[model samples]
Target: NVRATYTVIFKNASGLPNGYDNWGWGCTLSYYGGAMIINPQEGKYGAVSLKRNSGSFRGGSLRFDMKNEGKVKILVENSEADEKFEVETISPSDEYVTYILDVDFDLPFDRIDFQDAPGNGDRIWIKNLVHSTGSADDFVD
Candidate 1:
């Protein structure tokens, strides 16, 4: 068995980088130095997703660093074959916070979604992302 990890940090990017996709949730995304800014359109839902262009992953954990301007409801999903899935919700915070999830399974997953977030012109900042694939072990160091 092999374990691996990947981190995504956007630097002056105009659009979503590193296999990320904006899922037409009426949100505007702007990437700045080491972070991604999200502005949800008024009265509309917002979402973003990621899937490696090369392949999928299995049995690992995901972490995200984020901050929000207003009350936000975030849902994180890991999809297996676009069928089997797991979802988690996050509490909003004004200051930057790290959210982590361990959803290691025997099956493989290709897509992860950050959906149903702040719908009333709220601003969100995603500082960075960390994904550890092929391992169920959670760590702090």
Candidate 2:
């Protein structure tokens, strides 16, 4: 897979690093099957945006490979399609969950903002960000 980086530009996540800081969340940077929490966050947002500095790409689906102790929420922005939406899924365990968003047609999106997540009351470490055009049966080992 190609290397991609994220700018922690909002609440409910590891913050700062605006301007694409160029810190790639590299391979398997996600939370392993079992890990311990270091610290959490207040969990919220303000039309906050965690946009990508990279160019736009098209997709038929979105596979978000992430992990969190509390419920997760994100304001997803698909610039290519000129679309926007939010994602809120519960990840109360250490294991990773694959959220396969949209399989009907391609949805071009790249940026996601943490939208006022208050259920977990802690920070969620993203193991990896995966958005693809495939089945959502879930992630396989």
Candidate 3:
């Protein structure tokens, strides 16, 4: 069996309204000839959500890793709205890539999702799921 880890990040650019509700990303991993090991188990997988007035917007990046080439999906929603994004067939060989999703109020949103397609085996590893606003002091109370 092979164990793979994954992570996510959310960024809120300047000028965008604060207080965002309901936000997260998810994906399923399938392996070949072996069982897949996902840390923390289901429902308790890698995720980050805002609570009450803590859903303020900030600009930053989410970082994670995938071991094998399989299928991965990412989605971000505001409250319960259907504002989601998806990306498919990430190369297993290409482990690291920075996705820039920025919401400037003037635009809809800045988010990205990954969905690994078939032909690629399962067993993906993910880690370092972080969300930041570029600068270390970008977040203000």
Candidate 4:
């Protein structure tokens, strides 16, 4: 089955923060310096909700730049699928991690979710949020 992935397109670096929100279950979104700091020591559950005004928000590969404090495992959940689907940060460090999530073509997700990675002082500073609605492009784009 062709998993229905979201369409993703990146405009530029740093600018992504303008559309992202910061905060955890224990703390508010932290945008110190130039990255989205995901501090787990705060021992909190949180995410920077994605805000897009167009496209099938959940049908593309979500890519971004992330600096990991260690092994912070970020989970990209398609609200419709919940933990049903999983994504791996494609790239890491300065290049950030290119996380590509392809959901089951049968359904659509409500939104994306970010969680804490299970490791020492593992935190995540994310920028350049890119989502590509590629369902229409196919194995082509």
Best by TM-score: 1
Whole-model Cα lDDT per candidate?
0.60, 0.44, 0.35, 0.47
lDDT for each residue of candidate 3 in 13-74, tens digit (9 for 90 to 100): 22112443323334333333322322222343333232223443333333444454444444
TM-score of each: 0.70, 0.48, 0.38, 0.56
lDDT of residue 105 for candidate 4 = 36
Give the per-residue lDDT digits (tens) of candidate 4, residues 20-119.
4332354344566566565555444444445332323544555566666454444444443444344543323544654444444344544455555443
Pairwise lDDT winner, candidates 3 and 4: 4
Off by over 4 Å in 4: 1-28, 42-56, 78-84, 89-106, 135-141
lDDT against true structure, model 1: 0.60
Off by over 4 Å in 3: 1-59, 71-73, 87-89, 94-114, 119-121, 135-141
**Order of candidate numbers by TM-score, starting with the best:** 1, 4, 2, 3
Please give the TM-score that candidate 1 achieves against the real structure. 0.70
The residue-by-residue lDDT of candidate 1 on 21-140, one tens digit each, is 554466766777767777677777675555555556665677677787666553333443455454465666778887767764556666666544546677777755666653435444
lDDT of 2 by residue, 30-102 (tens): 2233321223334322123445777543433455445555565654666566676664445465766656554
